[PDB]
Scaffold this active site. Sequence first.
Site, PDB file in Angstrom:
ATOM      1  N   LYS A 175     -16.457  -7.857-102.107  1.00 13.82           N
ATOM      2  CA  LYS A 175     -15.548  -8.906-102.562  1.00 13.82           C
ATOM      3  C   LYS A 175     -16.224 -10.265-102.654  1.00 13.82           C
ATOM      4  O   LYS A 175     -16.085 -10.995-103.631  1.00 13.82           O
ATOM      5  CB  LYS A 175     -14.330  -8.948-101.644  1.00 13.82           C
ATOM      6  CG  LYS A 175     -13.344  -7.853-101.994  1.00 13.82           C
ATOM      7  CD  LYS A 175     -12.362  -7.544-100.877  1.00 13.82           C
ATOM      8  CE  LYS A 175     -11.141  -6.763-101.354  1.00 13.82           C
ATOM      9  NZ  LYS A 175     -11.357  -5.300-101.265  1.00 13.82           N
ATOM     10  N   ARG A 192      -5.912 -28.391 -77.716  1.00 15.09           N
ATOM     11  CA  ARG A 192      -7.253 -28.236 -78.329  1.00 15.09           C
ATOM     12  C   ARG A 192      -7.783 -29.523 -79.027  1.00 15.09           C
ATOM     13  O   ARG A 192      -8.879 -29.522 -79.550  1.00 15.09           O
ATOM     14  CB  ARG A 192      -7.307 -27.044 -79.302  1.00 15.09           C
ATOM     15  CG  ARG A 192      -6.841 -25.723 -78.684  1.00 15.09           C
ATOM     16  CD  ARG A 192      -7.243 -24.508 -79.507  1.00 15.09           C
ATOM     17  NE  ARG A 192      -6.789 -24.557 -80.887  1.00 15.09           N
ATOM     18  CZ  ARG A 192      -5.623 -24.096 -81.324  1.00 15.09           C
ATOM     19  NH1 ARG A 192      -4.719 -23.521 -80.525  1.00 15.09           N
ATOM     20  NH2 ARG A 192      -5.351 -24.205 -82.577  1.00 15.09           N
ATOM     21  N   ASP A 247       4.347 -26.798 -78.433  1.00 12.54           N
ATOM     22  CA  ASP A 247       4.359 -25.804 -77.381  1.00 12.54           C
ATOM     23  C   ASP A 247       4.293 -26.398 -75.951  1.00 12.54           C
ATOM     24  O   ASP A 247       3.339 -27.141 -75.576  1.00 12.54           O
ATOM     25  CB  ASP A 247       3.188 -24.871 -77.569  1.00 12.54           C
ATOM     26  CG  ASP A 247       3.016 -24.421 -79.007  1.00 12.54           C
ATOM     27  OD1 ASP A 247       3.818 -23.608 -79.479  1.00 12.54           O
ATOM     28  OD2 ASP A 247       2.089 -24.904 -79.670  1.00 12.54           O
TER      29      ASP A 247
HETATM   30  C1  LIG Z   1       0.644 -16.966 -83.166  1.00 14.30           C
HETATM   31  C2  LIG Z   1       0.089 -16.600 -81.809  1.00 14.30           C
HETATM   32  C3  LIG Z   1       0.010 -17.546 -80.832  1.00 14.30           C
HETATM   33  N1  LIG Z   1      -0.498 -17.278 -79.621  1.00 14.30           N
HETATM   34  C4  LIG Z   1      -0.668 -18.252 -78.538  1.00 14.30           C
HETATM   35  C5  LIG Z   1      -1.909 -19.081 -78.725  1.00 14.30           C
HETATM   36  C6  LIG Z   1      -1.482 -20.330 -79.492  1.00 14.30           C
HETATM   37  O1  LIG Z   1      -2.290 -21.504 -79.335  1.00 14.30           O
HETATM   38  C7  LIG Z   1      -0.010 -20.457 -79.082  1.00 14.30           C
HETATM   39  C8  LIG Z   1       0.937 -20.228 -80.234  1.00 14.30           C
HETATM   40  O2  LIG Z   1       1.514 -21.264 -80.807  1.00 14.30           O
HETATM   41  P1  LIG Z   1       1.306 -21.562 -82.340  1.00 14.30           P
HETATM   42  O3  LIG Z   1       2.046 -22.886 -82.291  1.00 14.30           O
HETATM   43  O4  LIG Z   1       1.647 -20.380 -83.167  1.00 14.30           O
HETATM   44  O5  LIG Z   1      -0.257 -21.909 -82.506  1.00 14.30           O
HETATM   45  P2  LIG Z   1      -1.124 -23.285 -82.526  1.00 14.30           P
HETATM   46  O6  LIG Z   1      -0.536 -24.367 -81.642  1.00 14.30           O
HETATM   47  O7  LIG Z   1      -2.464 -22.839 -82.079  1.00 14.30           O
HETATM   48  O8  LIG Z   1      -1.292 -23.732 -84.078  1.00 14.30           O
HETATM   49  P3  LIG Z   1      -0.419 -24.833 -84.940  1.00 14.30           P
HETATM   50  O9  LIG Z   1      -1.231 -26.099 -84.901  1.00 14.30           O
HETATM   51  O10 LIG Z   1      -0.313 -24.288 -86.334  1.00 14.30           O
HETATM   52  O11 LIG Z   1       0.912 -24.883 -84.241  1.00 14.30           O
HETATM   53  O12 LIG Z   1       0.316 -19.201 -78.476  1.00 14.30           O
HETATM   54  C9  LIG Z   1      -0.997 -15.962 -79.361  1.00 14.30           C
HETATM   55  O13 LIG Z   1      -1.474 -15.749 -78.233  1.00 14.30           O
HETATM   56  N2  LIG Z   1      -0.963 -14.988 -80.295  1.00 14.30           N
HETATM   57  C10 LIG Z   1      -0.431 -15.248 -81.516  1.00 14.30           C
HETATM   58  O14 LIG Z   1      -0.343 -14.402 -82.418  1.00 14.30           O
HETATM   59 CA   LIG Z   2       4.474 -22.571 -81.372  1.00 16.98          CA
HETATM   60 CA   LIG Z   3       1.707 -25.045 -81.996  1.00 20.69          CA
END
Ligand SMILES: Cc1cn([C@H]2C[C@H](O)[C@@H](COP(=O)(O)OP(=O)(O)OP(=O)(O)O)O2)c(=O)[nH]c1=O
Ligand SMILES: [Ca+2]
Ligand SMILES: [Ca+2]
Length: 326
Positions: free
Chosen positions: A63, A174, A183
Amino acid sequence: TLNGGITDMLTELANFEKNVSQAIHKYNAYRKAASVIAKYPHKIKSGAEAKKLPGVGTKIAEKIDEFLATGKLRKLEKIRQDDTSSSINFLTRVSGIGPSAARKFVDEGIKTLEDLRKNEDKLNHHQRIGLKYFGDFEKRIPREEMLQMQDIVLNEVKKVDSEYIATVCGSFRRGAESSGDMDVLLTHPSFTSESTKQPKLLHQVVEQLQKVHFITDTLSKGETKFMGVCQLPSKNDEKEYPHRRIDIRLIPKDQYYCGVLYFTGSDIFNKNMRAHALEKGFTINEYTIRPLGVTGVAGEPLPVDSEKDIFDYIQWKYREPKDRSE
DNA sequence: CCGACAGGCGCATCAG
DNA sequence: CTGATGCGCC
DNA sequence: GTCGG
Ligand SMILES: Cc1cn([C@H]2C[C@H](O)[C@@H](COP(=O)(O)OP(=O)(O)OP(=O)(O)O)O2)c(=O)[nH]c1=O
Ligand SMILES: [Ca+2]
Ligand SMILES: [Ca+2]
Ligand SMILES: [Ca+2]
Ligand SMILES: [Ca+2]
Ligand SMILES: [Ca+2]
């Protein structure tokens, strides 16, 4: 950006496999290749060069050659013309509609946002709310707003009980300059792996945030997890802030480090780290890390005193939160 | 060549 | 009603 | 779709 055309193409193929084909392992293998390619610090010049990376195989490398010679992928160009595929993919962007419900709606003629809006009687509660806030939820949250949201939640939590600790995780912890959603990891001394000495621990936090109008809707809510919607207050003559997705997780206080490791992510990093733990004979979840015996049976929880402890068990050098992205 | 692919909460639904 | 399963989500 | 035993 460096190999942005490649990784975009793979991500779009991963979405197809997930949403249309309902093949979760092909989805995850496309995301694994995308990720590994995104961290590779050279401009990829051929498929055979990508093949050297872990998670890139015969088929992805073919690909990548096509994409490099022509700038497109015939397989994707077809998928983009297929109305059914496009409709299923579109519909899964509504929070609460996954691959299965999207396919079902599309079979019933429900193909557009317009179709969704005039059939909300066919949507469950979560889906109703994801439809109501469809555009707001695809917006990102600048860190400046994440900081004001943090200040609200930490202060309200403290008004309910000074012994609660609330930590904002995900992409925020992060160090990201914008986040998709918020969260919140929550501990209280009355809830440990050995006993729950107080009921309603999460409910009381949610109630207080609804009282000050921070939380505006609830998607799901049980004893340890809340998924909902919140909104910063706006001032006089200002446009309202978009509604945002919020997740709050109450974790036993003695399992804080496993909890915060899980909740800091990224999702891909957790999959990688947990897959690596299995190779080393351990299993990691949000509560504990435990050895894996011959049977495949998980043994007793290892003592954990810090985030780094978990990394030590599996013989990984510590990665700081900001190096757990992508 | 072929198992195994991270791990689990809350919700909706099905069989009894 | 309980218990099992799968969806959608983190 | 990919990979290690
Ligand atoms: C989606 C997902 C999240 N998680 C965990 C790790 C993530 O940091 C947290 C999930 O929240 P998310 O808010 O889905 O992830 P995020 O904060 O990293 O990215 P964004 O900036 O788009 O919000 O939970 C998992 O362990 N497995 C998963 O499939
Ligand atoms: Ca979330
Ligand atoms: Ca998040
Ligand atoms: Ca490879
Ligand atoms: Ca969705
Ligand atoms: Ca309003």
